[PDB]
Design a protein around this ligand. Structure first.
Ligand code: BLA
Length: 166
């Protein structure tokens, strides 16, 4: 969908998927097919392998909320930050944890080589509906350092008015 093939950025070192569990609020995201809504959250829970179970939830414009259940598993237990996201009726897409503090923020990247083009996902997630605008900028610097159009990014709405039932 986007011209050019995938870059290979650096990922989180000594990534602990146990400290990555819990709820993560979406702060910024690259536009895509699937996330056509707001009030988006990801909840990661125990899974037998190297990874976690996935519950992604968002509220749509019409008010009804839509969730997906999935799995994120590391295929190389020695590289815990490079995981694969498996979901019902689809081929797995990558799930790379580029950077995280486990307690406040996380930067996740994903890219699929599509012939001469590529498809990509990117997400700034926080442990609260907001994240300090200074950390957003620092993470946008990392993203732009490897080709990510930080200017195509969409700020997810996490305002109580619209997300008044979560
Ligand atoms: C690297 C980033 C990234 C990947 C690999 C990704 C994968 C991904 N997210 C999806 C849905 C979704 N994904 C999210 C949200 C997230 N999903 C996340 O991985 C993160 C970090 C959030 C934000 C907290 C939500 C809310 C849906 C449901 C979309 C719907 O209602 O159909 C779907 C398919 C939905 C369906 O089957 O209908 C895929 C393949 N999304 C991403 O943003």
């Amino acid at each position: 969908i986007k011209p050019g093939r995938c870059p290979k950025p650096a990922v989180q070192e000594d990534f602990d998927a146990a400290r990555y569990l819990g709820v993560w609020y979406d702060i910024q995201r690259l536009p895509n097919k699937f996330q056509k809504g707001e009030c988006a959250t990801a909840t990661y829970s125990l899974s037998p392998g190297v990874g976690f179970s996935v519950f992604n939830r968002e509220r749509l414009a019409n008010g009804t909320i839509k969730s997906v259940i999935g799995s994120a598993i590391a295929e190389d237990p020695c590289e815990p930050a490079k995981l694969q996201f498996f979901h019902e009726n689809a081929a797995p897409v990558p799930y790379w944890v580029l950077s995280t503090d486990y307690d406040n923020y996380a930067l996740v990247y994903s890219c699929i080589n599509e012939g001469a083009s590529h498809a990509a996902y990117a997400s700034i997630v926080s442990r609260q509906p907001t994240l300090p605008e200074e950390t957003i900028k620092k993470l946008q610097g990392t993203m732009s350092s490897f080709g990510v159009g930080v200017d195509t990014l969409l700020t997810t709405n996490q305002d109580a008015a619209y997300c008044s039932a979560m």
